[PDB]
Structure 1
Amino acid sequence: GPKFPRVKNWELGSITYDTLCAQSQQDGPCTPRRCLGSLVLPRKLQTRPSPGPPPAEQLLSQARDFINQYYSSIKRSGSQAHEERLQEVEAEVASTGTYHLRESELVFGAKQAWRNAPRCVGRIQWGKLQVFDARDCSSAQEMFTYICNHIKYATNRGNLRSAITVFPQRAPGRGDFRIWNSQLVRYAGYRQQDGSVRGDPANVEITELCIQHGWTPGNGRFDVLPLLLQAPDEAPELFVLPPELVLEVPLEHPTLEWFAALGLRWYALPAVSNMLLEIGGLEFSAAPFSGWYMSTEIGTRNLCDPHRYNILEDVAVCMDLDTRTTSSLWKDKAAVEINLAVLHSFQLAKVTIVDHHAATVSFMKHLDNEQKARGGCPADWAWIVPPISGSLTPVFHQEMVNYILSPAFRYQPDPW
């Protein structure tokens, strides 16, 4: 039949065609010979640093293209305002080499970039995003203030609200605005003497970087790291977040009274801050965004991954499960009780959280919405399915097509 990817839902038997992928202008990692679709960081999603300004011709088309998406969203394609804005963009690129977005355009692309994120299962909220314009920012100290305002608004005392703060874009012959940390809120990872790590092994490099930059270290599993904010052509400056601004949740179990005594906890606000935001060819090297957690992110990946808190065994022991044999499914039993702990603790502290069931069910609804609106939705299957109970969620049975659409959130090299 149709000349587009046929996509099927095995639970429902329903069929759809993805026509939206025709819009993709950025190549992926796969070729007809092999699928490189399980690679976390292929050199097809990552945006290398451009030491020199993008070729005027290529910037122009990415820009002309973005403006078109913008006007189509307001339903003024072909209009005088549309054609004028186009002439205005090339005029600016012609004399300066780059151009700038209007306030409403930035808000559009930012929402669009989230909307285009293949690995995000919470895109049913894509329209609800508070875009804080911070393109006026000119110092690392000011970045700190904006971030504190971001955390305050976004955290909203446990009734979290999605938001992103856009700092100045990459400008030729001038350094980038960078947040060295991966997230605004992270736990320190201390490299022990015996070789191990106290805290979060993931954050070991940044922890040592903060120390080398004047940070006075603590020695706990859950120490919140300080921000290492960087302004153009200046070394990064260290800033310590006010404890009152960082809302955390002490984990406890609804039935297993001893879970509380484990001293486990997690911060309520998830804010990626190392990702690059690309809109119409313009690159925003620092633009932290945040929403709310899905239970499995904390209870399974963060707490149970081998290379993270790895608390699976400790909980298994407390539960008195046979940790000597795999066929007892002690890893399965503990993980379920740990996720149940994250859910219970957050629901008690009145902090926002969504479980993997409700989360995937809502993404399916988002998929219907997008089929009607754009004829498809770029989705990364391995990332959409929860790290536990996979086939128990509707998304598992949903085939997905993955591709890159702009605007978008891309990975970028570490500033060091």
Structure 2
Amino acid sequence: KFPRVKNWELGSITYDTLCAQSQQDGPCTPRRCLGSLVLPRKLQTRPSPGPPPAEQLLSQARDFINQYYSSIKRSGSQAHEERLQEVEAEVASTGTYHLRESELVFGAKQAWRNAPRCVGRIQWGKLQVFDARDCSSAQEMFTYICNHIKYATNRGNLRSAITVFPQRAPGRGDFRIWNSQLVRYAGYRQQDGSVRGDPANVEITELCIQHGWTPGNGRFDVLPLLLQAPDEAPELFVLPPELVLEVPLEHPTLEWFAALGLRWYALPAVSNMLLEIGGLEFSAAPFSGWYMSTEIGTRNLCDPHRYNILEDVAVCMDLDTRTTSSLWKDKAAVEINLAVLHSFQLAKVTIVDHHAATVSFMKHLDNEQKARGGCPADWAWIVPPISGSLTPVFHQEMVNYILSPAFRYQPDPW
């Protein structure tokens, strides 16, 4: 029942008892493991055909509230009971309820803390929670989003933050941010079928053009936002260039790298995920912290289905691109990651390398082992895309399981 978890570098061992609190099922079954799959369809968050059994929501809600009060140690107090009564009251009459700002702040933090795929969870306690449930239009989301970006960026000294927009309402549309991240480079499919820019953003780039945006023709054209208000066609808003901080990329000892004119934005801000707290679902809650160098240098720039600049660089490095055994890929990958780290540090913008980052995650596991008796972690996502066993987490066994509050994936609006 309670997993025996071992680290193979320190022979240490623990017993994950935190998974007992998991009330949602993953994709694995005793017959076959599907832990390496990216998406579900089973862990997904289907829209609202109607009101969910008052008993269900009520239960998720009762549990969350209990969490919040244990949180502030006032468990069993009067306020705790009066708060439960409240929630049961609202639900019984309207089929739903709402959260107090202090609970939202607690929930958002627990959601990050429970994020099995996040390696930066050691920062979970420090989170700036902008409340935007007081939003009635897309015009407004744009402003809120602009405030978040402005604050989170802080001229390079990045600060973690999340902005929570109106929870989903049964029998009503959903506030939604169509973009996958608040900031992403457009992908233009040029005749040859090939792509100019970011292949990952071909679709969202299309949709934008389809709603009026007049595209550009560059490799790094910052995409406009397509904010959607309940049951209304999305609206298009361009992001103020002064607002979008970017880091030109150059290399420490290789003068030519800069020539490549590669660049990347400073704010990683996933914006299409769903935040679920006490049964409530927040369809639009963008969050941001700061990049870990490999996300840009390894996946974004070297993925074959991304900017795939791996060969262009090896050529310049005068490498033997003829055979695999020359390790021209491994050699060029490390320089590109070095270049990202170097450039961000030079532009005085927050960034964390994969070594330092996984070290902090180890500490986090420790801190969490003591605090809750375990930590849900997705091994395949926690181990960096390069130098895996070269980091401490590669050698750490992990247990994956779903806990709430939680960030979950959700279907595309279109």
Where on the TM-score scale, by shorter chain, does this alignment land: which range? over 0.9
Q: What per-residue deviation string (whole Å, max 9, x for no partner) do you get for residues 346-398 of structure 1?
A: 00000000000000000000000000000000000000000000000000000
Aligned to 2:404: 406
* Structure 2 equivalent of residue 228 of structure 1: 226
- 1:53, CA displacement in angstroms? 2.1
Aligned residues of 1:29 and 1:43 also touching (Cα < 8 A): no
Residue 45 of structure 1: how far off its partner (Å): 2.8
Alignment deviations for residues 173-215 of structure 1 (CA, whole Å, 9 cap, x no partner): 2211000000000000001101100000000000000000000
Unpaired runs of 5+ residues, structure 1, are none
SS at match of 1:35: coil
2:48 and 2:171 in contact (8 A); partners too? no
Give the equivalent residue in structure 2 for 1:171: 169
1:302, CA displacement in angstroms?
0.2
Q: Distance in 1 between matches of 2:44 and 2:300?
A: 23
Q: CA deviation at 1:84?
A: 1.3
CA contact (8 A) 1:270 1:293 kept: yes
How far apart are the structure 2 equivalents of 1:57 and 1:233?
28
Q: Residues 267-297 of structure 1, C-alpha deviation per residue, up to 9 Å, x if partnerless?
A: 0000000000000000000000000000000
Q: Which residue of 2 aligns with 1:44?
A: 42
Q: Secondary structure at the match of 2:242?
A: helix
CA contact (8 A) 1:294 1:354 kept: yes
CA distance in 1, matches of 2:349, 2:48: 40
Task: Give the superposition deviation at 1:315.
Answer: 0.3
Cα-to-partner distance string for 1:293-333 (whole Å, 9 max, x where unaligned) = 00000000000001100000000000011111000000000
- Identical residues among aligned pairs (%): 100
> TM-score when scaled to structure 1?
0.99
Deviation at 1:140, TM superposition (A): 0.3
> Is this contact kept in 2: 1:191–1:204, CA < 8 A?
yes
Task: Indicate conservation of the 8 Å contact 1:6/1:16, yes or no.
Answer: yes
Q: Size of the alignment, in residue pairs?
A: 414
Which digits, 9 at most, give the CA deviation of each residue in 1:41-96, with x for residues without a partner? 02233212223221111100000010011001011222221111111101100111
| Whole-angstrom distance in 2 between the partners of 1:179 and 1:105 | 23
> C-alpha offsets along residues 123-150 of structure 1, whole Å, 9 cap, x if unaligned?
0000000000000011000000000000
Q: CA deviation at 1:154?
A: 0.1
Q: Assess if the C-alpha contact under 8 Å between 1:107 and 1:131 holds in 2.
A: yes
CA displacement, residues 224-267 of structure 1 (integer Å, 9 cap, x when unaligned)? 00000011111100000000000000000000000000010000
4+ aligned runs moved over 3 Å, structure 1? none
Gaps of 5+ in 2: none
Q: 313, 316, 321: which is aligned to 1:315?
A: 313
The answer (yes or no) to whether the contact 1:278–1:284 under 8 Å persists in 2 is yes
TM-score under structure 2 normalisation? Answer: 0.99
- Report the Cα distance in structure 1 between the residues aligned to 2:345 and 2:242, rounded to whole angstroms: 20
Cα distance in 2 between the residues matched to 1:5 and 1:130: 34
